[PDB]
Design a protein around this ligand. Structure first.
Ligand SMILES: [Cu+2]
Ligand SMILES: [Cu+2]
Ligand SMILES: [Cu+2]
Ligand SMILES: [Cu+2]
Ligand SMILES: [Cu+2]
Ligand SMILES: [Cu+2]
Lengths: 339, 339, 339
């Protein structure tokens, strides 16, 4: 398309919402291609990632970890206004794996504190894609400090299964998984720092052991458990978007399954079906579609159970509805053996 | 199905056998849905996992690591009687990834020493699935202490390749891969403990380094080598079921291939073909089908060669038959260069 | 085929070239099956793997790490002459994952210094396959010392996408990824040794931590960056072969995508499409096909960004051509926020 053609396309401004929720959108595209505008501010701030008061200097898109999920349709243009406040201390940029050229946009979006930039790219490929900050020479540090998220480029005709059958979800949640590498003092206690830069050296040596100290969903251990559990009802169709910008993960819905899973996250690649545990390599986003059949609590985890229950990668789903005894029943409840 | 309908279905009681063997079953289902009864006892006992006398307090279904493979057909009901002897010291339960609801059954099967429970669930999805103990608050510990296995839910019409061609195996073996995390004293020597609970704290800190001390097949280094090698003959079709309840693995049959591989372990997802090394994420089971064409010894390994040959993840297949020189021949046997 | 039939087949001798380049070949097979002869010498030599002067005693096929890529077509016979010079100190052999029988050929090719052997095998399965040295009792050590490479068995009719469409590449590059485990003294400085064998013990204990000290492409940090960047032009179709004989990797072309990816590396398994990051398990080779649409520098990395930018797994592609503003444009270049 020529510049004049792109300029005459209708524009839509979107208000981003905090994860795990997603901004309003239509699954089946309404009309022709559009220019969809998003605005994100970068916040460098301290966040507590566990119940022991462990602090980390996060670098967050819109103040959250992960950054929000942006949704567009194939062949729409995504136009991002990215702002780095004058109160921040580092240069940041953004690389959209959904984009083509200039290191995903990272080469055209380097902004220092007090600057802003506007980048536009055509969403030519459908699927879920990771986006993350990637400043030359400090790439892994910004990513493992939480500066990453994901976008979803829906096919214009909505989601479909392997054989053309339409798949419409009632709800969608975005689970961003993050590996943190927090330094510990000579006593095995987590260290705290005044400013982001002061933690760099120590963090890098923890990073080189390739063993995270924490692995969490939505920025903190237990962030999506208890009162913050994700919800659904029996009969509802849910799409769960999962991203990991740096490290492998293996999602599994305990008590349920992955009816249709685009483990690689690309909609033109047929989904795998009836999955128990799927695999998302570091540097990618994946999506699973499931229709709940039983009520109760479900645990959604990284199925390396140590990472899930010892490091923090575990979330809850609270589902309402009626129990189905055909699918599962307790014939004899736990009781003492009668001698 | 109503309760009265399930009650009128024919019942079949199955006697489980120790891995790597599998109980007798038919590939193509005989008739309509059935209620298939299995019984498993939980044994807490010390096992030696290597040739250095290294001991571990295993928590084993039917006394083996892995627990046995249970086989049913799609839409059959699996009814398990689970028993926790009064001589055990911990509460245990079971989560079937093949099941729908109540955390895979874990929420309905918590039994203390001296108790039993009976759980029934409909096997709605075909494929190989992991099952494991998962007590609230102590999930990874029971899993890495060996309390896991797998089940196979065969399609009613038997196995088929991507394009409807029937696949009938002559033999089937179940390889359970286990990651152990054994504590070491100040001298680098493995520690021993009186009771399961006494090893908990030390084991947990080894678990957090995410680096196992041992990675074995059938519960011990060399468990499936030498005289215990799995067997086959040239021309025979073999199905190899592989499970890993907590950690990723990458199976590879050295000297052979994976003609058809359901790496994700789900039969409704077409198999990948002609595989050299496949990948099974932690929290899943996979299956590979191969027709032997050459006699001799084959090594079946986790292809991270350090885990295979240094940590213990290596097994043997001894195959009888005649050598095929068309496929491979030594034109010039190793000999001194003639100067 | 009988011996007389194989003996009457035409023969072709191939001169191997150093990675990342590949020897001349035709994508679509010219005529019938052939016997393709390759010759490789084994070199035990010291190589420097980073800019800090870190040395390693490599064991290299044809003196390079990885060894060269050999190309044949399905049903051709590959006949390898393998030579172990009298000046080497260890016995070596070779296991072709592309081969059937005798541990991939390893059981028929054990040669001591001063010996040679000739092995022939029929390339029955199409795809990219790893090959590596595997001497009994010292398998992982030879592999992580660099003795591995890959071969490509092209379908006789050339590459095709999932639905029969022909895929013809203009260029092909072979990226061999290697994990090294270099011992460090009491001061955290890399140790040096006189002979291969003298480093064995120390290396093995680093290997058991399963954490490499370096992860590189083409044998050294930065080996494929700067002036040694791989090249292409906008509009050109490139096939990138990637292998990892021992450890998992997750390739990603920063700024681009994987239009068609045989992540498992087997051509009879349909490719995944529009990939951002794909996964190649240790013990396998994979291939990605991409058509460049934008000029500039691209980074090709293992997308665990710590392994890429801290450990060495990063390469460059320099692409010439004209920028396409439809795909991506800087609407507002980084500039100060106007207050
Ligand atoms: Cu940043
Ligand atoms: Cu589980
Ligand atoms: Cu238990
Ligand atoms: Cu191998
Ligand atoms: Cu060697
Ligand atoms: Cu990236």
């Amino acid at each position: 398309a020529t510049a004049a053609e792109i300029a005459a396309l209708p524009r839509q401004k979107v208000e981003l919402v905090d994860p795990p929720f997603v901004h309003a959108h239509s699954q089946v595209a309404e009309g022709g291609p559009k220019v969809v505008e998003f605005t994100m501010v970068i916040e460098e701030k301290k966040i507590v990632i566990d119940d022991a008061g462990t602090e980390v200097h996060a670098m967050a898109f819109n103040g959250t970890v992960p950054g929000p999920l942006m949704v567009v349709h194939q062949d729409d243009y995504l136009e991002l206004t990215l702002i780095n406040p004058e109160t921040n201390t580092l240069m940041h940029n953004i690389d959209f794996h959904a984009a083509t050229g200039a290191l995903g946009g990272g080469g055209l979006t380097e902004i220092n504190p007090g600057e802003k930039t506007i980048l536009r790219f055509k969403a030519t490929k459908p699927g879920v894609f990771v986006y993350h900050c990637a400043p030359p020479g400090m790439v892994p540090w910004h990513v493992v400090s939480g500066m990453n998220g994901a976008i979803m480029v829906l096919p214009r005709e909505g989601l479909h299964d392997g054989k053309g059958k339409a798949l419409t979800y009632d709800k969608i949640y975005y689970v961003g998984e993050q590996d943190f590498y927090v330094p510990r003092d000579e006593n095995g206690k987590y260290k705290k720092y005044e400013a982001p830069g002061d933690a760099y050296e120590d963090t890098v040596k923890v990073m080189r052991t390739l063993t995270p100290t924490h692995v969490v969903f939505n920025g903190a251990v237990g962030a999506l458990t208890g009162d913050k559990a994700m919800t659904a009802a029996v009969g509802e169709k849910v799409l769960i978007v999962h991203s990991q910008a740096n490290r492998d993960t293996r999602p599994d819905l305990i008590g349920g399954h992955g009816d249709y899973v685009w483990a690689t996250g690309k909609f033109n690649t047929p989904p795998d079906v009836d999955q128990e545990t799927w695999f998302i390599p570091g540097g990618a986003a994946g999506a699973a579609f499931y229709t709940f059949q039983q009520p109760g609590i479900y645990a959604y985890v990284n199925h390396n159970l140590i990472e899930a229950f010892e490091l923090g990668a575990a979330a809850h789903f609270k589902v309402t509805g009626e129990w189905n005894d055909d699918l599962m029943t307790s014939v004899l409840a736990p009781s003492g053996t009668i001698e």
